[PDB]
Coordinates of C-alpha atoms and ligand atoms in Angstrom, one line a residue:
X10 CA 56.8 5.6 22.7
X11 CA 56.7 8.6 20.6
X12 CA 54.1 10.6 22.7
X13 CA 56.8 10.3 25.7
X14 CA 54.0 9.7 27.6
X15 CA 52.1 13.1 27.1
X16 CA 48.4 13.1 26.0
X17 CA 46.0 14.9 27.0
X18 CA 45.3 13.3 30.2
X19 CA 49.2 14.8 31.1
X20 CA 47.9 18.3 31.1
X21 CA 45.5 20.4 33.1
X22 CA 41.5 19.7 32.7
X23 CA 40.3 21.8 29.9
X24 CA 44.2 23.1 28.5
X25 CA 44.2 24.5 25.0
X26 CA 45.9 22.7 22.3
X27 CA 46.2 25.1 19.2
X28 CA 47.8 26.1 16.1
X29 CA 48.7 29.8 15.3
X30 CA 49.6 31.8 11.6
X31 CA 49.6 35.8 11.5
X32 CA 47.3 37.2 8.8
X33 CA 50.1 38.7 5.9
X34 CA 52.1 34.8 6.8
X35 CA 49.3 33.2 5.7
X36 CA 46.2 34.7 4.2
X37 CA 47.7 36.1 0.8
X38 CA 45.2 38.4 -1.4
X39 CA 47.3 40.9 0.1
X40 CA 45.9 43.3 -2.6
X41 CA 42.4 42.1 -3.4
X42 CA 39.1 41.7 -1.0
X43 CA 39.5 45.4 -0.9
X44 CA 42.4 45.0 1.4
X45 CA 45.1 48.3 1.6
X46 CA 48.9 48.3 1.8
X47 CA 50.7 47.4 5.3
X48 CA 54.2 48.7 5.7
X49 CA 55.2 44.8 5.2
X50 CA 53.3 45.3 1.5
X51 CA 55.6 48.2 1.2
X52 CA 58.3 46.2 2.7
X53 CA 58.7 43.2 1.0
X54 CA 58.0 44.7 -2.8
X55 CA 61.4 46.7 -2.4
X56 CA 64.1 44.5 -4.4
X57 CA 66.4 42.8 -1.6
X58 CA 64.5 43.6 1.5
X59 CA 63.2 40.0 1.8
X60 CA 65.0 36.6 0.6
X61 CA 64.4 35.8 -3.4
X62 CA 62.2 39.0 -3.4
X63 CA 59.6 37.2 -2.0
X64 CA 56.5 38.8 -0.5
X65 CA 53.0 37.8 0.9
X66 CA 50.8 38.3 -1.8
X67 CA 49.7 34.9 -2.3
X68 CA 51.2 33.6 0.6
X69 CA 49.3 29.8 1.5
X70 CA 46.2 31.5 0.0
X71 CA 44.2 30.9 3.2
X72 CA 42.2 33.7 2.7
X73 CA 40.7 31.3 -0.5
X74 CA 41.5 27.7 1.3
X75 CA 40.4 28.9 5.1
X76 CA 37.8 26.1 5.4
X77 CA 40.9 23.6 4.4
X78 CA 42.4 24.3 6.9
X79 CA 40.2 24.7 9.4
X80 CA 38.9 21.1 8.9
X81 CA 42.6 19.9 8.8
X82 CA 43.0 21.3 12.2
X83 CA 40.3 19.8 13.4
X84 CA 41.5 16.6 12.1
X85 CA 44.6 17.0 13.9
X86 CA 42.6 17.3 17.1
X87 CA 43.7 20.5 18.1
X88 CA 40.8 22.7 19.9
X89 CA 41.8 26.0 18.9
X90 CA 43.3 28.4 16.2
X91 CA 45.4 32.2 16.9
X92 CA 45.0 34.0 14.1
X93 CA 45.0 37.8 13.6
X94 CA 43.0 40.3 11.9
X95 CA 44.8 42.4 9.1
X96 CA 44.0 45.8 10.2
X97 CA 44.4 47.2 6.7
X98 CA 42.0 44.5 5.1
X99 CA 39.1 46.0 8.0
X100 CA 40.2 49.7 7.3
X101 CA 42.0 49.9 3.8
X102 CA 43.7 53.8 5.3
X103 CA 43.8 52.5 9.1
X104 CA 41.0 54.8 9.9
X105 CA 37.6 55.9 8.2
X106 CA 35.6 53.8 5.4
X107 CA 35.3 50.0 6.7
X108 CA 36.0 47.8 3.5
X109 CA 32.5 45.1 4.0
X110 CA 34.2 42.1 2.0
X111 CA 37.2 42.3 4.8
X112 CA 34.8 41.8 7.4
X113 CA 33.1 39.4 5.3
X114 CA 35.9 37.4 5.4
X115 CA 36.6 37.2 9.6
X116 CA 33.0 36.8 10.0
X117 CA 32.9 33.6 7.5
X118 CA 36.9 32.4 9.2
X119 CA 35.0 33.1 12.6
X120 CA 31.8 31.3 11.7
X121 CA 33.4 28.2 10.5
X122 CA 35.8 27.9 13.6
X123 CA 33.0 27.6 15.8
X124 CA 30.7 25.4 13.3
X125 CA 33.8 23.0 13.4
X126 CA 34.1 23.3 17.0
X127 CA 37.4 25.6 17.2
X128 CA 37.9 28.5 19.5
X129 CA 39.0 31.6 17.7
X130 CA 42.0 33.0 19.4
X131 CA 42.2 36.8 17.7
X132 CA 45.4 39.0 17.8
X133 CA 44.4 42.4 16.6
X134 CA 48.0 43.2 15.4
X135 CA 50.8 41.2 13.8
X136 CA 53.6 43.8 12.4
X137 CA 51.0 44.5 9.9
X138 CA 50.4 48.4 10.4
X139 CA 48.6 49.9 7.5
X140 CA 50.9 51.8 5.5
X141 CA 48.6 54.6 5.5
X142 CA 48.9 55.6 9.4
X143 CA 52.6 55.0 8.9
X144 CA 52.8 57.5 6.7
X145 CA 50.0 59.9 8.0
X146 CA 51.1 59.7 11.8
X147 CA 54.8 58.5 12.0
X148 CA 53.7 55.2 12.9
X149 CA 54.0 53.7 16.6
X150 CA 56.1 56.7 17.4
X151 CA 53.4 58.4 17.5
X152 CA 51.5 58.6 21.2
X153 CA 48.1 59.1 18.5
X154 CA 48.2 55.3 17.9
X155 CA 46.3 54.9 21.4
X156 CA 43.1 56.4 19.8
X157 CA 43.9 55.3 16.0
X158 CA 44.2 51.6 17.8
X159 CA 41.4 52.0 20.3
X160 CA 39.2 52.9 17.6
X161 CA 40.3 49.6 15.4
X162 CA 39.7 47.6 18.5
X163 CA 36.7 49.3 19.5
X164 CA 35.5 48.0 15.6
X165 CA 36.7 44.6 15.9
X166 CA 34.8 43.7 19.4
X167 CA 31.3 45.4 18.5
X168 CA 32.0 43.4 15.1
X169 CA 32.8 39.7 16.0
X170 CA 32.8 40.2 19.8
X171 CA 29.5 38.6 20.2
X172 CA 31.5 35.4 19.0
X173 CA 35.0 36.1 20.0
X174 CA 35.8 35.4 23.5
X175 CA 40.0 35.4 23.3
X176 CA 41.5 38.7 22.4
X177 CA 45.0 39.5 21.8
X178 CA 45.7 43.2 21.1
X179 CA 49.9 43.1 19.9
X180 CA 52.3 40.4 18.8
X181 CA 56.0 40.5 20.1
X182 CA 56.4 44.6 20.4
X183 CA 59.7 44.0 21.5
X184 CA 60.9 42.3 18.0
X185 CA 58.7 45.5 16.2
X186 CA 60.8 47.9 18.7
X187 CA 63.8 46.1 18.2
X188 CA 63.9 45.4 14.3
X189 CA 62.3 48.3 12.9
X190 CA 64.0 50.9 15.2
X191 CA 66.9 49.5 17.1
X192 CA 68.5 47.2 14.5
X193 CA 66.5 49.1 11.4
X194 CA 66.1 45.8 9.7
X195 CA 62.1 45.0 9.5
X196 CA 59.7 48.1 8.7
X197 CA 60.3 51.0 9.0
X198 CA 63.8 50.1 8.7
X199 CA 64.6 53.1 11.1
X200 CA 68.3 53.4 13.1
X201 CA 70.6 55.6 13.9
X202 CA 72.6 54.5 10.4
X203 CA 69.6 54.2 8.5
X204 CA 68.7 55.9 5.5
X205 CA 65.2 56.0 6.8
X206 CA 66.3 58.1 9.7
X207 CA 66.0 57.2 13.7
X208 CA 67.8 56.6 16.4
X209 CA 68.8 53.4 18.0
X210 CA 69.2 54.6 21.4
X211 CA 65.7 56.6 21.6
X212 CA 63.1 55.1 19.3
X213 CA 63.0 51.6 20.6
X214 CA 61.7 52.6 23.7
X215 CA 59.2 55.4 22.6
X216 CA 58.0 52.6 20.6
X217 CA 57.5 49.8 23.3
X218 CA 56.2 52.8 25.3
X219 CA 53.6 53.6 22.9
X220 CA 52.4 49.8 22.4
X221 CA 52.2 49.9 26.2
X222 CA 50.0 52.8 26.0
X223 CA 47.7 51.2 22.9
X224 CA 47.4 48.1 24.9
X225 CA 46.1 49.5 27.7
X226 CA 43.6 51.9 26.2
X227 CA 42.3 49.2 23.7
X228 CA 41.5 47.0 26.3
X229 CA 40.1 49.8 28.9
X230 CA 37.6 50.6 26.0
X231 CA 36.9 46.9 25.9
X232 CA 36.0 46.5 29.9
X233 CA 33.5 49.8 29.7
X234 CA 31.8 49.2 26.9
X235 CA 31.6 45.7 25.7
X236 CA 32.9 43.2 28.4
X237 CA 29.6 42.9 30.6
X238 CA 27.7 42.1 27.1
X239 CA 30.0 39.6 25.9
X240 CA 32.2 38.4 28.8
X241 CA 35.5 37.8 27.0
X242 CA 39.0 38.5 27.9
X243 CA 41.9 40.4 26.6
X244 CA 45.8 39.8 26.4
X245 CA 49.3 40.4 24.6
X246 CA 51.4 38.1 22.6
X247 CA 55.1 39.1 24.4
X248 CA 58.5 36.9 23.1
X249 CA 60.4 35.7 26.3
X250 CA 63.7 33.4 25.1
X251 CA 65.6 32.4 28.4
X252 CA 69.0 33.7 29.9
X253 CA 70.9 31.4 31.9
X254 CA 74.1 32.9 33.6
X255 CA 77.4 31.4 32.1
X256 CA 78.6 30.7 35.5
X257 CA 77.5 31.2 39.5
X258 CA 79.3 34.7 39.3
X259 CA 77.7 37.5 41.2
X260 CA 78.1 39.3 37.7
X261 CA 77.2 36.4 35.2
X262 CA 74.1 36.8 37.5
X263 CA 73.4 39.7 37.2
X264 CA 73.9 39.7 34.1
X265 CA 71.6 37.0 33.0
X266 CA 69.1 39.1 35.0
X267 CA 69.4 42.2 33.2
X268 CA 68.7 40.2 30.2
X269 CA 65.4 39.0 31.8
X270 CA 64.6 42.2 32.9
X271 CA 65.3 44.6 28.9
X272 CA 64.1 41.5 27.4
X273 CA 60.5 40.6 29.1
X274 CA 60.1 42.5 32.2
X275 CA 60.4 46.0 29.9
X276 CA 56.6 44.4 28.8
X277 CA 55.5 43.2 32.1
X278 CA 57.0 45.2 35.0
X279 CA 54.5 47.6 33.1
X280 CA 51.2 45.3 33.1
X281 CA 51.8 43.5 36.2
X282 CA 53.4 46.2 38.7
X283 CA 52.7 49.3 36.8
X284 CA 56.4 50.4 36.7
X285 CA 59.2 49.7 34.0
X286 CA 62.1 47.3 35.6
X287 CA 64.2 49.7 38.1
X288 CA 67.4 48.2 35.9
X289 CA 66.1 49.7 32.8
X290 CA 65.2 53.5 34.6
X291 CA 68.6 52.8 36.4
X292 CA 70.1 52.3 32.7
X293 CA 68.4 54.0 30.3
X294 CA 67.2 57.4 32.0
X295 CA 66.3 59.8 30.5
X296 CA 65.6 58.0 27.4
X297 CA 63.0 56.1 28.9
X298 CA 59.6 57.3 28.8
X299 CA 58.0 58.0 32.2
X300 CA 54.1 56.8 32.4
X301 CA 52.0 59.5 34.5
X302 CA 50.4 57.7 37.5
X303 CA 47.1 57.9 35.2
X304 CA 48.8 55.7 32.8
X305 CA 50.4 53.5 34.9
X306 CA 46.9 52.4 36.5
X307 CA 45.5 52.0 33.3
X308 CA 48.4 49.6 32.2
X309 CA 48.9 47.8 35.4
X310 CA 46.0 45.0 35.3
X311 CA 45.3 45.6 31.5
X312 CA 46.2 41.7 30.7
X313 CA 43.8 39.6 31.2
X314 CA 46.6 36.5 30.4
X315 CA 50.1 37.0 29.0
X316 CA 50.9 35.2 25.7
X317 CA 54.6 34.0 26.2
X318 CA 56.6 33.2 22.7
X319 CA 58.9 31.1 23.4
X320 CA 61.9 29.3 21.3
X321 CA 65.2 29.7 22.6
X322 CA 68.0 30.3 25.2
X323 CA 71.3 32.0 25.8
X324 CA 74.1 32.0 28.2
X325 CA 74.7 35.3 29.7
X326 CA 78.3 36.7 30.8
X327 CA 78.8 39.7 32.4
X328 CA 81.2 42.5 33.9
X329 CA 80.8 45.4 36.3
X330 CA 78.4 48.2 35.1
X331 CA 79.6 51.1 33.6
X332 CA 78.8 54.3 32.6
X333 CA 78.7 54.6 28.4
X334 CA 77.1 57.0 25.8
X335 CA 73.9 55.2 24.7
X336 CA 74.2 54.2 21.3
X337 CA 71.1 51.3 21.2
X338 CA 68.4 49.5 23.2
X339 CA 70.4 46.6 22.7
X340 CA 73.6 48.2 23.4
X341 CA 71.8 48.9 27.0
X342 CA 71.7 45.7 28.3
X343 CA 75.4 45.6 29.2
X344 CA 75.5 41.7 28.5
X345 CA 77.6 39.3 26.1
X346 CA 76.1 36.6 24.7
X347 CA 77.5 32.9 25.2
X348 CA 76.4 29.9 23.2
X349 CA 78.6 27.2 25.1
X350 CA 79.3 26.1 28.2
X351 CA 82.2 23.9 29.5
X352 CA 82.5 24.0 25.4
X353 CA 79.7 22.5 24.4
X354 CA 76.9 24.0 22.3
X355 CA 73.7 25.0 24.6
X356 CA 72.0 23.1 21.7
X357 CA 72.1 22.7 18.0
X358 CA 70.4 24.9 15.9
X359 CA 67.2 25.1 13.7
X360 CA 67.2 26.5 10.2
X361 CA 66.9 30.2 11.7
X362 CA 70.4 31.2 12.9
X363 CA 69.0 32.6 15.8
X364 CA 67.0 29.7 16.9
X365 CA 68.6 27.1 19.6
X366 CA 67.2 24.0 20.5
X367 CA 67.3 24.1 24.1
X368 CA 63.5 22.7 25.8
X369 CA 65.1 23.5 29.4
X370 CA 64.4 27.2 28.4
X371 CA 60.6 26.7 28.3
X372 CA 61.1 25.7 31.6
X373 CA 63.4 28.3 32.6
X374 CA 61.2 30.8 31.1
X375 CA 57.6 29.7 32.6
X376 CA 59.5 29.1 36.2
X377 CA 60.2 32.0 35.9
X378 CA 57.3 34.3 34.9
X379 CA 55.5 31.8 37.7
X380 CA 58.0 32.8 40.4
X381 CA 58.8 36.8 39.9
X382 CA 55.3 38.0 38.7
X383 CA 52.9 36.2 41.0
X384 CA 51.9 33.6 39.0
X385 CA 49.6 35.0 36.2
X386 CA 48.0 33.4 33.8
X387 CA 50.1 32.7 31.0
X388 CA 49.4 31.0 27.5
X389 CA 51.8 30.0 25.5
X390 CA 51.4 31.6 22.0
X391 CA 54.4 30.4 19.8
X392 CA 56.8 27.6 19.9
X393 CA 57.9 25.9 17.0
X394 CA 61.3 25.4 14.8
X395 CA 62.1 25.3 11.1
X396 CA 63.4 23.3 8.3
X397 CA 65.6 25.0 5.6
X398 CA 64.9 25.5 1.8
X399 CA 65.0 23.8 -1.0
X400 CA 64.3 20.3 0.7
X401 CA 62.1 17.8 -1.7
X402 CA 58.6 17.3 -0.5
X403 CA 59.1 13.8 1.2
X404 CA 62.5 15.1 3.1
X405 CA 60.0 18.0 4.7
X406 CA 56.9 15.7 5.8
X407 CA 59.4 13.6 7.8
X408 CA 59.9 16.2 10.2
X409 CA 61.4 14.2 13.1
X410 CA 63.8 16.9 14.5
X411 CA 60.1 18.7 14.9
X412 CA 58.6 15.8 16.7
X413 CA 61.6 15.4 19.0
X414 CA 61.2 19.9 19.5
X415 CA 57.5 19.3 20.4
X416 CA 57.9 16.4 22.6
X417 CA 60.9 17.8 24.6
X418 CA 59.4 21.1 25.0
X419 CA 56.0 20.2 26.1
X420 CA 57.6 18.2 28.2
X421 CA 59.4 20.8 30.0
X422 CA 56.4 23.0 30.1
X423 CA 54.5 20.1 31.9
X424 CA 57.3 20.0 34.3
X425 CA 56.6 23.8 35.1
X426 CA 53.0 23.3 35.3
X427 CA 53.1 20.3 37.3
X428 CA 54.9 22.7 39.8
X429 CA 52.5 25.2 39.7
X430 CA 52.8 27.7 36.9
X431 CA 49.2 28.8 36.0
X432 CA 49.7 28.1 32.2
X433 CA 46.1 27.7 30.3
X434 CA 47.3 26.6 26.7
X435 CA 49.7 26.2 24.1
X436 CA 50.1 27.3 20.3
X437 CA 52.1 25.6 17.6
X438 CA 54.0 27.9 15.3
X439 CA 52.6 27.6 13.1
X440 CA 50.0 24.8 11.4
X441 CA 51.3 25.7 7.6
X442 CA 54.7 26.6 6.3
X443 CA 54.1 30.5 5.8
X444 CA 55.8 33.5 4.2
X445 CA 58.7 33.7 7.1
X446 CA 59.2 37.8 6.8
X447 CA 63.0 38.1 5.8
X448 CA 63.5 35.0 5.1
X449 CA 60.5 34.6 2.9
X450 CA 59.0 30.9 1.8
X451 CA 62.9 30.1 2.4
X452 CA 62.3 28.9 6.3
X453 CA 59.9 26.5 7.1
X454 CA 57.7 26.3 10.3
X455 CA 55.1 24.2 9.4
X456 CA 53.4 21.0 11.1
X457 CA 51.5 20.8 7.5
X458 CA 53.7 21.3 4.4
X459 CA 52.8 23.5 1.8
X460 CA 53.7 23.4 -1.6
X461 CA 54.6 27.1 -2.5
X462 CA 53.9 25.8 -6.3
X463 CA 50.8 23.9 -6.1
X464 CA 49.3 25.6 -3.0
X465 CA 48.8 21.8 -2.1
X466 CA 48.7 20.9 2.0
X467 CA 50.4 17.8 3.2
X468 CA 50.1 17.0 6.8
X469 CA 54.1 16.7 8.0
X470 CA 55.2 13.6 10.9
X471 CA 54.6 16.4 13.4
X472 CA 50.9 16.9 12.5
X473 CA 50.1 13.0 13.0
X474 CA 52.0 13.1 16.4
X475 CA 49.9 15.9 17.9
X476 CA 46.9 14.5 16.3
X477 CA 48.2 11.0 18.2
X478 CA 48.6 13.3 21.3
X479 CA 45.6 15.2 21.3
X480 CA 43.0 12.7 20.9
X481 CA 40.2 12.9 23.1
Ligands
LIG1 C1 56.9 34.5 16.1 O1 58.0 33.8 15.4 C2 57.7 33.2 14.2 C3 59.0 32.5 13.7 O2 60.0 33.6 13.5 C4 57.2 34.3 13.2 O3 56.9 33.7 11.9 C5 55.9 34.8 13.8 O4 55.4 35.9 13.0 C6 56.2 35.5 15.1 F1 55.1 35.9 15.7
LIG2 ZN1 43.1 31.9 -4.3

């Protein structure tokens, strides 16, 4: 049957079903509502930084639409929504004067959730950092984003705390410490090659250090001055694709292992033990920051639950470690990549390059977290795959490599939880084809279509299967 046997009644009592969008992806009136610049404003208006020149200021027009497509949610059965907050729509300059019709709008998003009977699930950050404290404070290279977030946070929970009960603080700072300072190809476009400036080797990690840092202070102000009022809970939205070693090699191993450990335990070594993996201090040295014990007692424990993104795998090779100038985070790792085995393809591929379709990684990658980091509770924030461009209307509602993704992938993750990984919920990226950063309206991730013409929604095959699979 279509459903492959998964309904509701295949899951824990009371496990979240949701959609998920970030707030420059989807809202659009990127300059209007009072809303300031973000660096990916900034960004994606600079000719050839994003496919066709595109940019988010229309976007799906959510911000107009919201209470669309929060009834078509509904109607799809699904019992919650991730969205995030655009910092610089709350605080145009990321600091100072609160612009009213911003908060306007969360409040009536927020309102209309719960009138329709869907939890709110709120990141506070998706890569949207208003250009303003980029360009006052150096942006998340600078330790001062711990207050300048703190104090955004602080706004946010006094503001629609009394409603919202699931926090997220960050989304994926890996890919932010990765792309915009490792690889210099998102905002700020900083490398060591870059004409921005940076330094591969060095900024990646300062970065990561300094979300670390935010995270943890955010959420300390939350516990002391709002939690015993409103009784809500705080996490982070990390990216964990699996690494499976190539072969049963002591190095291939290892290797896959030290993948593991610079890809998600740089995040979580931090916030579940209070230490960065000993491979990366082994590694990386001096280039790594060092948390005082101060720190390290206010990041350990700050999670409340861990959002896991999840999408892909890769087969890991290695060799013996050796010693080599540090040129880049990614350089550090010491690894090489393998897409085949026995030579075949660990899976075909999605639109985006990068993007494998391989459901034994979702179980890989929740066994995983389950088995090294004491079972903690873990919600699964992003999983989802995309069709290409350019595709007629009809051609992109009948989505049945989608359906097959969603089936075989939450089937996987119901094999880990049936074996004991606490996971509490799960969050389709995304409900709407959405402004897909470089790629622009070029890659689409929908379960609902949109027309980027029109504006026009149209519910895709994958919509009507979870609505089929969701029903209560
Ligand atoms: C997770 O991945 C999707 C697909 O690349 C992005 O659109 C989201 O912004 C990111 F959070
Ligand atoms: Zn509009």
């Amino acid at each position: 049957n279509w459903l492959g046997g998964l309904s509701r009644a295949a899951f824990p009592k009371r496990f979240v079903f949701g959609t998920v969008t970030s707030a420059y992806q989807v809202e659009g009136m990127a300059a209007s509502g009072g809303r300031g610049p973000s660096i990916w404003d900034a960004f994606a208006h600079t000719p050839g930084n994003v496919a066709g020149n595109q940019n988010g200021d229309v976007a799906t027009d959510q911000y107009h639409r919201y209470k669309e497509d929060v009834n078509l949610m509904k109607s799809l059965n699904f019992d919650a929504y991730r969205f995030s907050i655009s910092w610089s729509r709350i605080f145009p300059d990321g600091e100072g004067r609160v612009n009213q019709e911003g908060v306007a709008y969360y409040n009536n998003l927020i309102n209309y959730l719960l009138q329709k009977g869907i939890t709110p699930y709120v990141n506070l950050y998706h890569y949207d950092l208003p250009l303003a404290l980029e360009k006052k404070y150096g942006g998340w290279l600078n330790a001062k984003m711990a207050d300048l977030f703190t104090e955004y946070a602080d706004f946010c929970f006094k503001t629609f705390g009394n409603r919202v009960k699931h926090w997220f603080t960050f989304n994926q700072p890996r890919i932010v410490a990765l792309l915009g300072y490792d690889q210099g190809t998102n905002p700020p476009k900083r490398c060591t090659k870059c004409a921005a400036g940076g330094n591969s080797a060095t900024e990646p990690y300062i970065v990561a250090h300094n979300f670390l840092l935010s995270h943890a202070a955010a959420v300390a102000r939350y516990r002391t001055k709002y939690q015993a009022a409103q009784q809500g809970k705080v996490g982070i939205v990390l990216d964990f694709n699996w690494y499976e070693a190539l072969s049963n090699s002591t190095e291939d191993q290892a290797a896959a292992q030290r993948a593991r450990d610079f890809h998600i335990g740089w995040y979580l070594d931090p916030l579940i033990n209070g230490h960065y993996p000993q491979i990366m201090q082994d590694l990386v040295k001096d280039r790594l920051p060092k948390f005082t014990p101060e720190q390290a007692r206010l990041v350990k424990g700050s999670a409340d639950y861990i959002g896991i993104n999840q999408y892909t795998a890769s087969y890991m090779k290695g060799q013996q470690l050796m010693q080599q100038t540090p040129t880049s985070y990614s350089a550090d790792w010491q690894v090489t990549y393998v897409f085949a085995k026995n030579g075949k393809p660990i899976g075909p591929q999605a639109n985006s390059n990068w993007l494998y379709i391989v459901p034994w990684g979702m179980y890989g990658c929740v066994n995983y977290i389950k088995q090294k980091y004491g079972n903690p509770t873990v919600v699964i924030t992003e999983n989802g795959m995309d069709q290409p461009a350019n595709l007629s209307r009809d051609q992109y509602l009948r989505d049945t490599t989608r359906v097959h993704f969603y089936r075989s992938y939450l089937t996987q993750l119901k094999k880990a939880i049936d074996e004991g990984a606490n996971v509490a919920g799960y969050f389709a990226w995304s409900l709407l084809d959405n402004f897909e950063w470089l790629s622009g309206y070029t890659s689409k991730f929908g379960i609902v279509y949109v027309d980027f013409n029109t504006l026009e929604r149209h519910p895709k095959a994958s919509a009507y299967w979870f609505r089929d699979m969701l029903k209560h």
